[PDB]
Structure 1
Amino acid sequence: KNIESGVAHIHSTFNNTIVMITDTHGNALAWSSAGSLGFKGSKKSTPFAAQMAAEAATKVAMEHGLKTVDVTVKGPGSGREAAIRSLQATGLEVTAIRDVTPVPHNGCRPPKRRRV
């Protein structure tokens, strides 16, 4: 329950952001998202929704007990900045940041465009 620090996994996309706080070896400690907060439609894709997600997840995580986190960013979208600022505000000192945006190295065929 009570631990020292973990990680911040922030899977931001065009439709939703999903914040997940985990221990350094992996086993999770909290998570939340815009739909969890109660957002709908395009509101899920918002920095405010990412902010509220980080708020709720940090509240639960601090209720368990911790102080600081590393930040593992992944994906497009603009919730990154607002969510990180809200981590700082709700208390978790942002130890460090790194993006792990997967580079396919030309690995897979992506689907067609949204026309033709």
Structure 2
Amino acid sequence: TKFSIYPPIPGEESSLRWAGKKFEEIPIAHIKASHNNTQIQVVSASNEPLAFASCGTEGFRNAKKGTGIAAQTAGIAAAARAKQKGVIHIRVVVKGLGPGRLSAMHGLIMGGLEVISITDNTPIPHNGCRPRKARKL
């Protein structure tokens, strides 16, 4: 059977399973990759928080939070605390274009979790609020 790049539909029954569970039952790792910080929260499919880790909660301060290594460490910490609650497979939902967009996922993988899908949910207004003016540096 040809691999489908598209995620499974909740309604349409599918045979894809991960440790016996359907796609819509897998825990979700929400990564928020800001410009100066990366925050990772693992939640259950029913939206029950299991683990949380940010670059600041891992000891990094000021500019050191906005690096790849800090996001990787936060990912490892989140993956460890999620492993301690029975999480193996995760669906990654990444929001933002910060330096830790990919390093947090790397840290999650090195912490033992298996990523089955990647979703981007970066906020894109259809021209709502007015952004701030450019910096005159």
Q: TM-score, normalised to structure 1's length? A: 0.89
User: How far apart are the structure 2 equivalents of 1:24 and 1:108?
Assistant: 32
User: How far apart are the structure 1 equivalents of 2:31 and 2:84?
Assistant: 20
User: How far apart are the structure 2 equivalents of 1:58 and 1:8?
Assistant: 9
Residue 99 of structure 1 corresponds to which residue in structure 2?
A: 120
Deviation at 1:59, TM superposition (A): 0.8
Say if 2:74 and 2:107, in contact at 8 Å, map to a contact too: no
Does residue 16 in structure 1 map to residue 16 in structure 2?
no
The structure 1 segments of at least 4 consecutive aligned residues displaced by more than 6 Å after TM superposition are none
Q: Structure 2 matches for 1:68-87, cutoff 5 A? A: 68-87=89-108
Name whichever structure is richer in strand by fraction: 1
**Which of 81, 98, 112 is residue 60 of structure 1 equivalent to?**
81
Unaligned runs of 5+ in 1: none
Deviation at 1:48, TM superposition (A): 0.5
Point out the structure with max Rg over C-alpha: 2
Report the aligned-residue RMSD: 1.6
Say if 2:38 and 2:104, in contact at 8 Å, map to a contact too: no
Q: TM-score, normalised to structure 2's length? A: 0.76
Corresponding pairs, count = 113
Q: Which has the higher contact order (CA 8 A, sep 6+)?
A: 1
Deviation at 1:42, TM superposition (A): 0.7
User: How far apart are the structure 1 equivalents of 2:76 and 2:33?
Assistant: 15
Match of 1:79, SS state, is: coil
Residue 89 of structure 1 corresponds to which residue in structure 2?
A: 110
The one-letter code sitting in structure 1 at the alignment partner of 2:93 is: T
Q: Identity of paired residues, percent?
A: 44
Residue 15 of structure 2 corresponds to which residue in structure 1?
A: none
Residue 42 of structure 1 corresponds to which residue in structure 2?
A: 63
